[PDB]
Amino acid sequence: GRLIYTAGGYFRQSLSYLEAYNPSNGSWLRLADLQVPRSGLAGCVVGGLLYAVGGRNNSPDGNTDSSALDCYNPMTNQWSPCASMSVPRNRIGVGVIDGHIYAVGGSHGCIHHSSVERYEPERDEWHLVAPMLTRRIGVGVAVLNRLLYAVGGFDGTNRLNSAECYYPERNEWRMITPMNTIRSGAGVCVLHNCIYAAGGYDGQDQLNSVERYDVETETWTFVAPMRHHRSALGITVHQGKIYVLGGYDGHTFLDSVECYDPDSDTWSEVTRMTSGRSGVGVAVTMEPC
Ligand SMILES: Cn1nnc2cc([C@@H](CC(=O)O)c3ccc(Cl)cc3)ccc21
Q1: In the chain, how many domains are there?
Q2: How far is CA 138 from CA 86, 132, 207, in A?
């Protein structure tokens, strides 16, 4: 589109912020709040609607996992409720294929989901598809060549370097080559022919390392590390550059936004969020009004 939207997140408690960054002028706009605070959600866009999916409201009144799908229209600057998912999914991953949204894994209390469901905007309806081979929360999800990939995460016991691929016409998951790094709460996105996995948590450390999967070669390769170690980051692609937003470095809920240039293999500090936060949902679409 034209703007990087960041929704929700966590600082001290789950957040309701919706803010949009303009790479062209470096500015931030605060837009309409989410109706319910949530961290550990995912964002995506389909047909110029921004969607906020799953997560959890960590608050002093209690902690509630979210099965919610909420619809944001930039023309109106209004959030509307859309169909809820079959199940709450905190620390969810999301992918869009052919205008359908795939909601992947995430947790509900001590339940770590391997289940996967698909949203159809024309019908405002969720349907379960084949489950992943592994339970994954803090799962990175990306789409390339109309195939969905679930990358790393946490299965309830172990943080994962494993990854798998969903073939829609076969309704089937298959393992792919595992990453060289255990990552839970990495940022996962696609750029050209490669699935990137940036940062994450291995159970001891928040990571600055970045690696990429070439679907043709089936191998993962390290690229330049980010400037900041970060888990529970938001990630998006805007005009052939990767943007990473916030996260947690073991000390600070980061406001730092970094930008990856694949030609020069370099990360650069691009802006700061209006406040530090982790577990945000990020997506790109056109300006509001
Ligand atoms: C203390 N700490 N630092 N980074 C962390 C990441 C997670 C993961 C989940 C896990 O692997 O247990 C995580 C948290 C939030 C999000 Cl949005 C994704 C993944 C949990 C605790 C962490």
Answers
A1: 1
A2: 19, 14, 14
Count Cβ atoms within 10 A of the Cβ of residue 60 and give its class: 0-12 exposed, 13-18 middle, 19 or more buried. Answer: exposed
Residue ranges making up the domain that contains 191: 1-289
Both tokens of residue 183? 């990552």
Q: Which residues line ligand 1 (CB under 6 A)?
A: 40, 91, 138, 154, 159, 184-185, 201, 206, 231-232, 248, 279
Both tokens assigned to 143: 């789409």
Experimental method: X-ray
The answer to whether the CB of 164 falls within 8 A of the CB of 134 is: yes
Q: What is the CATH number of the domain that holds 134?
A: 2.120.10.80
* Documented resolution in Å: 1.9
Question: Would strands 56-59 and 107-108 be described as parallel, antiparallel, or unpaired?
Answer: unpaired
CA of 183 to the centre of ligand 1 (A): 10
